[PDB]
Design a protein around this ligand. Structure first.
Ligand code: HEC
Ligand code: HEC
Ligand code: HEC
Ligand code: HEC
Ligand code: HEC
Length: 437
């Protein structure tokens, strides 16, 4: 029936897909969760402690991460900390399109606890249901997220009515597996949510266009980065954007579902494409599953390598802004022209580190683009470092060859008890990166 949210009702017509839907050390890598940066990820990517201080750090919640059930306990805490209101429910309850239509601006301004109170108790933890992807009348794919994806498709110049079944096989995932921004009012309350797809087209939602959008919208300054004092925006899991940007598998005609919901019927388990002896891959690939596993590992190791290069280069710039501010506080003049150019280049580097870092395929969704973006992040950061090293030297402050990041000073009081960055550790990259923890 129309308006039936209960997956158990849909499960009486389609028991197989209902059965898979409710179902939920590794040699593969993962990036960071943009909305839940953990102490574990800071330990893995040490530059993140300095770059993300001011965004919020938390404990790794090692619980099942499937669509069917989503507990609200940690989402309540995070929401109330950020004053995000109902925003964090947008991609995590089939009631989100209904709540936003009925509450309007109040869905974003009303505290999380009061928005969650409106959802029936029997479905408080229902995450992503059949109604979010399927039309109940004919089981064809649909866009339940009109207020987010529907609006973002208009920005791309896409006629939603002319979308093919193949396009919907990725766009149904693009309802949530994309980057978003939260516009805020003067009282730091959330006043909306949008995908920064202005200026982009289908098959080309580039980091250049996303960054240009973020930097042009003063309302999406969601936090203050502590090391620099700069008000910045943020990027979260840009999976559809990275994948669809002319990637190898996008050009090959693969959709998200070819790897994540492969046929046998379409697998409704959100299981890893690397499991079951690479069965999702073997549908196109003639190579041994071990060869395919080794290729994913080589892509992920290459991406991690570039994440550390670009991340340590970006952290070096942020640390030099901190030295430049401390010099200004002492009455030393820092050359305005050098400083402004360095800040402009620094933001270009920072958003690129977050863009690839927050995408959890660790380069696999678009290996060539992951390389281009992280290579550009290093070029932007190294040029900002050039101008800040010069500005500091002009002001009488000599920056050594190895920059002391003092990573421990960016650990919250809770994090100091869980993690320590050895001050004697020195990163000396073959390309020029030279930092000490
Ligand atoms: C919003 C309503 C979503 C739609 C539509 C799709 N996904 Fe999703 N997915 C969403 C969330 C909020 C989460 C996290 C759940 C949690 O436990 O907090 C997920 C998770 C996945 C995963 C697992 C990732 C992980 O952290 O291990 C995968 C592999 C995944 N989703 C794939 C996926 C695909 C292929 C989709 C389209 C058919 C799709 N999702 C749609 C939210 C939403
Ligand atoms: C849609 C555009 C989303 C909004 C708005 C928010 N989240 Fe999210 N989240 C989304 C997806 C598709 C995924 C899984 C994919 C991936 O690569 O991780 C997630 C994941 C999380 C997680 C990690 C899973 C877990 O440990 O349970 C957390 C903790 C989480 N999301 C929190 C969170 C908060 C606090 C938000 C509000 C600011 C928020 N998310 C918004 C998609 C979307
Ligand atoms: C989005 C993230 C989905 C959720 C949640 C559910 N389903 Fe699904 N389903 C999805 C896709 C992308 C596809 C492939 C469509 C295509 O173009 O072939 C499917 C397919 C089905 C089908 C028909 C084909 C098949 O595999 O048998 C049925 C009958 C079906 N799905 C049922 C179903 C039910 C009952 C769900 C909730 C409990 C459910 N789906 C959730 C994407 C998504
Ligand atoms: C095959 C060629 C793929 C296509 C097309 C897409 N994805 Fe993928 N993804 C793939 C692999 C091999 C991996 C590596 C890690 C693994 O979980 O096995 C991933 C990873 C993800 C994740 C992260 C999972 C986690 O545990 O956090 C998500 C959420 C995800 N992929 C989503 C996703 C979406 C929405 C896609 C379309 C835009 C998409 N993937 C395409 C393989 C392939
Ligand atoms: C078909 C629909 C595919 C699925 C599903 C998967 N892959 Fe794929 N892949 C596909 C094509 C057409 C190509 C282009 C190869 C060519 O002839 O140029 C690829 C390529 C890759 C590569 C790169 C190989 C290289 O020469 O460097 C890798 C490493 C790869 N694919 C891995 C892979 C994995 C692990 C998959 C499952 C999760 C997977 N692919 C699925 C088509 C399709």
């Amino acid at each position: 029936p129309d308006g039936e949210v209960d997956p158990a009702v849909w499960g009486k017509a389609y028991p197989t897909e209902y059965e898979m839907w409710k179902k939920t050390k590794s040699k593969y890598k993962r990036g960071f969760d943009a909305d839940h940066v953990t102490y574990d990820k800071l330990s893995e990517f040490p530059y993140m402690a300095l770059l993300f201080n001011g965004w919020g750090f938390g404990i790794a919640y090692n619980e099942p991460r499937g669509h069917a059930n989503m507990v609200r306990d940690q989402l309540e805490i995070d929401s109330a900390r950020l004053k995000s209101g109902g925003v964090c429910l947008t991609c995590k309850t089939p009631y989100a399109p209904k709540l936003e239509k009925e509450m309007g601006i109040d869905y974003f301004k009303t505290p999380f606890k009061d928005v969650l109170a409106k959802i029936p108790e029997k479905h408080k933890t229902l995450g992503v249901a059949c109604i979010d992807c399927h039309d109940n009348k004919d089981m064809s794919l649909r866009i339940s997220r009109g207020f987010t994806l529907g609006e973002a498709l208009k920005k791309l110049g896409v006629d939603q009515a002319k979308l093919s079944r193949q396009e919907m096989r990725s766009l149904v995932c693009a309802q949530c597996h994309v980057t978003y921004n939260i516009p805020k009012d003067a009282d730091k309350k959330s006043i909306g949510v949008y995908f920064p797809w202005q200026g982009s087209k289908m098959g080309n939602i580039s980091v250049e266009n996303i960054i240009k959008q973020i930097r042009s919208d003063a309302s999406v300054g969601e936090w203050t980065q502590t090391v620099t004092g700069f008000k910045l925006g943020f990027i979260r899991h840009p999976e559809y954007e990275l994948f669809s940007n002319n990637s190898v598998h996008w050009k090959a005609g693969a959709a998200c579902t070819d790897c994540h919901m492969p046929y046998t019927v379409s697998d409704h388990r959100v299981m890893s494409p690397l499991k079951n002896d690479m069965k999702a891959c073997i549908q196109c690939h003639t190579e041994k599953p071990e060869w395919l596993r080794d290729q994913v590992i080589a892509i992920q190791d290459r991406t991690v390598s570039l994440m550390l290069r670009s991340g340590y280069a970006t952290a070096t710039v942020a640390k030099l802004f901190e030295k430049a501010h401390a010099a200004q506080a002492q009455g030393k003049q820092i050359d305005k022209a050098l400083y402004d150019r360095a800040k402009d280049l620094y933001e270009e580097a920072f958003y690129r580190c977050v863009f690839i870092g927050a995408e959890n395929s660790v380069g696999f969704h678009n290996p060539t683009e992951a390389m281009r973006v992280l290579g550009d992040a290093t070029a932007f950061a190294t040029k900002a470092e050039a101008l800040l090293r010069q500005a500091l030297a002009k002001a009488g402050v000599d920056v050594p060859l190895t920059v002391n990041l003092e990573l421990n000073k960016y650990l919250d009081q809770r994090g100091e008890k869980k993690l320590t960055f050895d001050p004697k550790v020195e990163i000396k990259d073959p390309y020029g990166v030279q930092v000490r923890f």
